[PDB]
Write a protein that binds this ligand. Structure first.
Ligand SMILES: Nc1nc2c(ncn2[C@@H]2O[C@H](COP(=O)(O)OP(=O)(O)OP(=O)(O)O)[C@@H](O)[C@H]2O)c(=O)[nH]1
Ligand SMILES: Nc1ncnc2c1ncn2[C@@H]1O[C@H](COP(=O)(O)OP(=O)(O)CP(=O)(O)O)[C@@H](O)[C@H]1O
Ligand SMILES: Nc1nc2c(ncn2[C@@H]2O[C@H](COP(=O)(O)OP(=O)(O)O)[C@@H](O)[C@H]2O)c(=O)[nH]1
Ligand SMILES: [Ca+2]
Ligand SMILES: [Ca+2]
Ligand SMILES: [Ca+2]
Ligand SMILES: [Mg+2]
Ligand SMILES: [Mg+2]
Ligand SMILES: [Mg+2]
Lengths: 425, 54, 352, 438
């Protein structure tokens, strides 16, 4: 019994989190009412990692829904699986955060954070042995970004020895809501560098390009992008939700993936990604080629621009584990110039027999690559283009922030970029 | 090629063949090591809480 | 796409092999410390054999046989011949040799003097030569006192062996020479003899009454090009190749290189390498080995062939680098890692 | 009769321990319920098998074993498995969260809080022994518990049982069956702090077992079950002398006397033959010469290395099955005339031979085929140093960048303990070279 507490904050965080529970509920045989209707014991083997067991054999997700406005969470509660969430785990305000990191972190968010922590504390007190926490949120808004990183800071204060994990959606001008997203992202990235153990970087531009160029979606919607995030979140957590000895728990995954405490930002990937030739069987060589192809990754970073510190691959479905090892060893041995040579055997592979819904087999990719610095470089450049003219700063100073805090967030991320650069050489 | 020390019993036998002749920390010190590492963990956590208190 | 690393930058032979491998567009060179390699062109000294063959999914191959130093060390070769029953102490193609440790350090001093005194009393030729592996450091003398005193002034193991006083002298010139044969042993332990050898000749007349001037007694390519005044007079770079040498043996001695010499060379190569095969074979090993050897022979006036030494990291004659290096790629590297004639080698068959 | 207590630490130790005791029971005719019909002394006795099994008044034969793991999932398999009835709950110790492949977490953070409990459970077993010899300790090098908690336990055992011998069965890390990148760190850290407390350690390289399973057993992708059943056959061959009537290696002290003349060089190489697939139509039974000759082939060594380029300090031949001394000496003579076997000049060139007439027992439904004769050779070669070199090299590559070091420092370990442990290994490699090379 190694329980994980799930938190989803803000519009993006709640919309992506909703789909996440919708996907894994289907995999574990949990219906919208919390009743189990699967046909395999593997589904319930590690079911208590994400679900609490209530009276009558009901399974309730260990999820906490947080937002500063009610709109998005009303939709979740009215959504497909909306009734499966614990009613008391909806914690929301009415003011909103106005896409403002300061409102989520210092003013509006501060007024609501204590009530969220009461729910977190309640979920933790019922855990036989809490592994840690995972948070879904975007970095470009106000609630998930500002109040999300506030929650992380206070969770770490109350549970300093638990693992903190996040799925963080990075903003992109191509899929943008407001011009202040680089401000909110730079402020959050510093908080993540300090107070998370693992952050899966999800770039909305990568998700967009995949929907447009690969999936052949003429006009991608947030829903389409979230389908990619759902499928990816299910892949990276397969190790935690089913029987296995590789990256079995959050701390063991961190120990194998994070060689330096600040370089804990991962590029995820998923395969296949087929446009609707969708019934064609996919071979192991094809799964591996795509899984390592940049076009299949969601950080919008070219891996051939940096080097992999560590890699974790997860293959799902009934397949030749012998042929898995062969193709994985083929990728490393045919491109070993992109893997640092001072971390021996830094590519780990894991197999799982249960494939995702509607797929004979799939592969999820988790890479700790120095190429991720390109993502922070983009954000830093957009930040400085506005900050050099102090554009849009009044939204933040009006909430009590000072310009010095922006300068420090700027330096902190440029330091992070420099730290990646030294390990790429 | 000599056989020596032949011992036989109901369940087996053993012998030696020669081809050629030839030519701590106390309980106290263990506790200090453990407690010293525990102290370094407490100090590091105190600095973390102090950082969070700021 | 096969991968290889280079760990000996001073190797002229494997510099060309590395150049050829890349020319195929099917081999990729990695940094010298990258362990994900198929082929290692290893260093001469302290090659880390223990780290080979532990990479999952990689068939790994190295260009040196672990333990072949026993054959390619002056003192080691002497000990191997005297102690191996396959070669025996009465081995008829290796000059009488003795291992002599300087007195400032088993040792065969007394055994050498016994055989030395026997020759001195029987009016026989008693000219010996002292040498070692730590040389560029050679002394030729007929007095045992000078030979032993010369070794004590040094601090490394030496070997004293009989000096061939009746060498075969080419004409015109009356000059000494030695024969260098290149031999490639692949991972299956096939013994391939390169069809091309080289006679490294002396450009000075052989003088048996003056062992003080060593230019006409030592046929090393570096000594002839530094202290000899007739370098390149008879043949380019004091290098006569088998075609010319064979034509000579026919015009002067009415015989062929194959009959008079090459049979003895092939016999010697087989005997040496078959002897150590059980100790260095990589048949059932987690990695594979091959290696290029440079055998050096001496021919006496009776057309009897003598083994001088075996070199583990030999160099090649300038005119023969292309052909031999391509051969190394064909039979030694591509035989394990195939690519997407009339062989230049002579297979010396034997029982494994 | 003198008792031996087996201690299993971490996932590797526990699962290998479970396979061994399964084999021990089939060998001694003990049923899953602990009953032993052949034992005519009910509730007691000082027979050879009593070194590993105690007895209750009801006739149950209970292993003298303690299982320890900082996480309950692996030991819960024993509590509900085929042999759940053999052990009682006091023998099975489990925590709630593991060491996360972190030596410092198993040794310091978690080890400090559970060490006194483990010692108490061992003390209960020791109090049943009339003349305890010592301990057999099973663990992996790579796990956080197997590495970190074992070294702490070995330190305390030397304190609480100063005059008792301690042997190890250690699992050397192999990437083909490992997902932990820091295992070289853990291996070197645990060897440094365990070196002075272990009298004799049998290393098994998972790479060797893995390839034997694929090559000889025709298993395309071996599992831990396949690996552990083969490992327990080798373990059984090594401990048979303590559990059966005999005169060779009859107590733990003799293991050191016959295998370890120099205390630091206490890692004997194990070689086992023959390993034959059960799925085979039917195999031609190998002779004493053929299986003995097999003991000098790298393919069947528990650690891949080249004994032709080392020097032997001791050599035991442990035969099980239809084997008479006449054939052993005949095959040995023939092997000397063909193989490269060089002993150190300060040791006799000889072989200690033990023969047990009972052929190897094979678990029903397992992968190994029944064979009429088998041998396990235990030789102390300097060639096994190749394994330290490999491991120390991987250590140097990561430590040069201080990769993953913060995980250990964060659990209370000082960075200086890395270099302190590495320097001890550098001295260990130097000792092997001084003994083996000229
Ligand atoms: N041969 C064999 N090796 C195993 C087995 N289980 C784990 N290993 C090896 O042990 C190493 C991992 O260490 P573990 O023993 O699993 O870890 P641990 O001792 O439980 O310590 P923790 O970090 O707390 O989990 C890897 O190299 C595995 O290949 C097993 O059942 N048989
Ligand atoms: N016993 C002997 N009788 C006659 N000449 C000898 C001899 N031993 C050595 N020589 C001469 O010495 C020369 C080379 O000696 P040696 O081979 O021992 O030194 P070396 O190893 O530095 C040259 P290489 O390794 O390139 O063959 C030969 O050309 C040979 O003519
Ligand atoms: N992938 C994805 N991104 C979103 C979604 N909704 C908003 N975003 C992104 O998140 C950022 C806006 O943050 P948002 O979550 O709406 O603000 P918040 O409610 O205050 O936390 C912008 O970069 C948007 O592009 C969504 O449903 N999916
Ligand atoms: Ca208010
Ligand atoms: Ca009894
Ligand atoms: Ca002791
Ligand atoms: Mg919004
Ligand atoms: Mg030489
Ligand atoms: Mg464990």
């Amino acid at each position: 019994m190694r329980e994980i507490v799930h938190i989803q904050a803000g519009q993006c965080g709640n919309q992506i989190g909703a789909k996440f529970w919708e996907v894994i509920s289907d995999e574990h045989g949990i219906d919208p009412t919390g009743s189990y209707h699967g046909d395999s014991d593997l589904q319930l083997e590690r079911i208590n990692v994400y679900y609490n067991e209530a009276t009558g054999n009901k399974y309730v997700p260990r999820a906490i829904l947080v937002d500063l406005e009610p709109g998005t969470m009303d939709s979740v509660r009215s959504g497909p699986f909306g009734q499966i969430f614990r009613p008391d785990n909806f914690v929301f305000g009415q003011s909103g955060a106005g896409n403002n990191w300061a409102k989520g972190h210092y003013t509006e968010g501060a007024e609501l954070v204590d009530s969220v922590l009461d729910v977190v504390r309640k979920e933790s007190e019922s855990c036989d042995c809490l592994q840690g926490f995972q948070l879904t949120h975007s970095l470009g808004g106000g609630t998930g970004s500002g109040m999300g990183t506030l929650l992380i800071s206070k969770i770490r204060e109350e549970y300093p020895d638990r693992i903190m994990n996040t799925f963080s959606v990075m903003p992109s001008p191509k899929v943008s809501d407001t011009v202040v997203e680089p401000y909110n992202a730079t402020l959050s990235v510093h908080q993540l560098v300090e107070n998370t153990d693992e952050t899966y970087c999800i770039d909305n531009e990568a998700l967009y390009d995949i929907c447009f160029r690969t999936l052949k979606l003429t006009t991608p919607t947030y829903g389409d992008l979230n389908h990619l995030v759902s499928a990816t979140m299910s892949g990276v957590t397969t190790c935690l939700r089913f029987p296995g000895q590789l990256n079995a728990d959050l701390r063991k995954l961190a120990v194998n993936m994070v060689p330096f405490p600040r370089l804990h930002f991962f590029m995820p990937g998923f395969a296949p990604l087929t446009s609707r030739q969708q019934y064609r069987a996919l071979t192991v060589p094809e799964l591996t080629q795509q899984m390592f192809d940049s076009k299949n990754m969601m950080a919008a970073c070219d891996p051939r621009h940096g080097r992999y510190l560590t890699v974790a691959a997860i293959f799902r479905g009934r397949m030749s584990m012998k042929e898995v090892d062969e193709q994985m060893l083929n990728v490393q041995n045919k491109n070993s110039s992109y893997f640092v040579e001072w971390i021996p055997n830094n590519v780990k592979t894991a197999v799982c027999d249960i494939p995702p819904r509607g797929l004979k087999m799939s592969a999820t990719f988790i890479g700790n690559s120095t190429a991720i610095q390109e993502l922070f470089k983009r954000i830093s450049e957009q930040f400085t283009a506005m900050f050099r003219r102090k554009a849009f700063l009044h939204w933040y100073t009006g909430e009590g922030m000072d310009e010095m805090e922006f300068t420090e967030a700027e330096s902190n991320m440029n330091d992070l970029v420099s730290e990646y650069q030294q390990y790429q050489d | 090629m000599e056989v020596i020390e032949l011992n036989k019993c109901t369940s087996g036998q053993s012998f030696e063949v020669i081809l050629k002749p030839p030519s701590d920390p106390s309980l106290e010190e263990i506790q200090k090591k453990l407690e010293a590492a525990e102290e370094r963990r407490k100090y590091q956590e105190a600095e973390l809480l102090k950082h969070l208190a700021e | 796409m096969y991968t290889f690393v280079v760990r000996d930058e001073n190797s002229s032979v494997y510099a060309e092999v590395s150049r050829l491998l890349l020319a195929t567009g099917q081999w990729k060179r990695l940094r010298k410390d990258n362990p994900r390699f198929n082929l290692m062109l290893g260093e001469r000294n302290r090659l880390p054999f223990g780290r080979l063959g532990h990479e999952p999914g990689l068939v790994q191959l190295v260009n040196y046989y672990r333990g072949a130093d026993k054959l390619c060390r002056k003192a080691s070769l002497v000990k191997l011949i005297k102690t191996s029953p396959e070669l025996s102490e009465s081995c008829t193609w290796f000059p009488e040799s003795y291992v002599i440790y300087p007195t400032n350090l088993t040792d065969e001093r007394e055994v050498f003097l016994a055989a030395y005194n026997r020759r001195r009393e029987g009016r026989e030729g008693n000219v010996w030569i002292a040498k070692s592996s730590a040389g560029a450091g050679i002394l030729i003398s007929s007095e045992a006192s000078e030979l032993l005193d010369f070794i004590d002034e040094q601090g490394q193991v030496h070997v004293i062996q009989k000096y061939l006083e009746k060498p075969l002298l080419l004409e015109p010139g009356h000059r000494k020479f030695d024969i260098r044969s290149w031999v490639l042993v692949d991972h299956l332990y096939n013994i391939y003899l390169y069809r091309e050898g080289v006679l490294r000749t002396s450009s000075e007349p052989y003088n048996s009454a003056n062992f003080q001037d060593k230019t006409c007694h030592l046929t090393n390519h570096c000594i002839q090009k530094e202290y000899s005044k007739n370098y390149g007079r008879y043949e380019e770079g004091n290098e006569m190749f088998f075609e010319e040498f064979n034509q000579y043996l026919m015009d002067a001695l009415n015989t062929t290189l194959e009959n008079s010499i090459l049979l003895q060379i092939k016999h010697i190569i087989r005997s040496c390498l078959m002897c150590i095969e059980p100790a260095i074979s990589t048949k059932h090993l987690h990695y594979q080995s091959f290696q290029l050897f440079g055998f050096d022979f001496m021919v006496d006036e009776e057309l009897k062939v003598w083994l001088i030494e075996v070199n583990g990291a030999p160099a090649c004659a300038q005119k023969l680098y292309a052909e031999l290096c391509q051969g190394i790629v064909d039979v030694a590297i591509s035989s394990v890692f195939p690519l997407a004639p009339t062989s230049i080698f002579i297979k010396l068959h034997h029982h494994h | 009769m003198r008792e031996c207590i087996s201690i299993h630490v971490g996932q590797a130790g526990v699962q290998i321990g479970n396979a061994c005791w399964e084999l021990y029971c089939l060998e001694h005719g003990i049923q899953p319920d602990g009953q032993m019909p052949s034992d005519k002394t009910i509730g007691g006795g000082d027979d050879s098998f009593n070194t590993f099994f105690s007895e209750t008044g009801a006739g149950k034969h209970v292993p003298r074993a303690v299982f320890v793991d900082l996480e309950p999932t692996v030991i819960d398999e024993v509590r509900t498995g085929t042999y759940r009835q053999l052990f009682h709950p006091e023998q099975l110790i489990t925590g709630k969260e593991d060491a996360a492949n972190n030596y410092a977490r198993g040794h310091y953070t978690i080890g400090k809080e559970i060490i006194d409990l483990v010692l108490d459970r061992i003390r209960k077993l020791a109090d049943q022994c009339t003349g305890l010899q010592g301990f057999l300790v099973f663990h992996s090098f790579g796990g956080g518990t197997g590495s970190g908690f074992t070294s702490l336990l070995m330190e305390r055992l030397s304190v609480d049982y100063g005059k008792k011998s301690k042997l190890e069965f250690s699992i050397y890390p192999a990437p083909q069956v490992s997902t932990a990148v820091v295992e070289p760190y853990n291996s070197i850290l645990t060897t440094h702090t365990t070196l002075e407390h272990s009298d004799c350690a049998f290393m098994v390289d998972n790479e060797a077992i893995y390839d034997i399973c694929r090559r000889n057993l025709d298993i395309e992708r071996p599992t831990y079950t396949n690996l552990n059943r083969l490992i327990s056959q080798i373990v059984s061959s090594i401990t048979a002398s303590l559990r059966f009537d005999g005169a060779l290696n009859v107590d733990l002290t003799e293991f050191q006397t016959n295998l370890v003349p120099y205390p630091r060089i206490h890692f004997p190489l194990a070689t086992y033959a023959p390993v034959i697939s059960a799925e085979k139509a039917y195999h031609e039974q190998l002779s004493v010469a053929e299986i003995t000759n097999a003991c000098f082939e790298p393919a069947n060594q528990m650690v891949k290395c080249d004994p032709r380029h080392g020097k032997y300090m001791a050599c035991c031949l442990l035969y099980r099955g239809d084997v008479v001394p006449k054939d052993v000496n005949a095959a040995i003579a023939t092997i000397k005339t063909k193989r490269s076997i060089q002993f150190v000049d300060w040791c006799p060139t000889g072989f200690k031979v033990g023969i047990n007439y009972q052929p190897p027992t094979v678990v029903p439904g397992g992968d190994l085929a029944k064979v009429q004769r088998a041998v396990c050779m235990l030789s102390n070669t300097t060639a096994i140093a190749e394994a330290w070199a490999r491991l120390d090299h991987k250590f140097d590559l990561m430590y040069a960048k201080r990769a993953f070091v913060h995980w250990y420092v964060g659990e209370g370990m000082e960075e200086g303990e890395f270099s302190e442990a590495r320097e001890d290994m550098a001295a260990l490699e130097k000792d092997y070279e001084e003994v083996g090379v000229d």
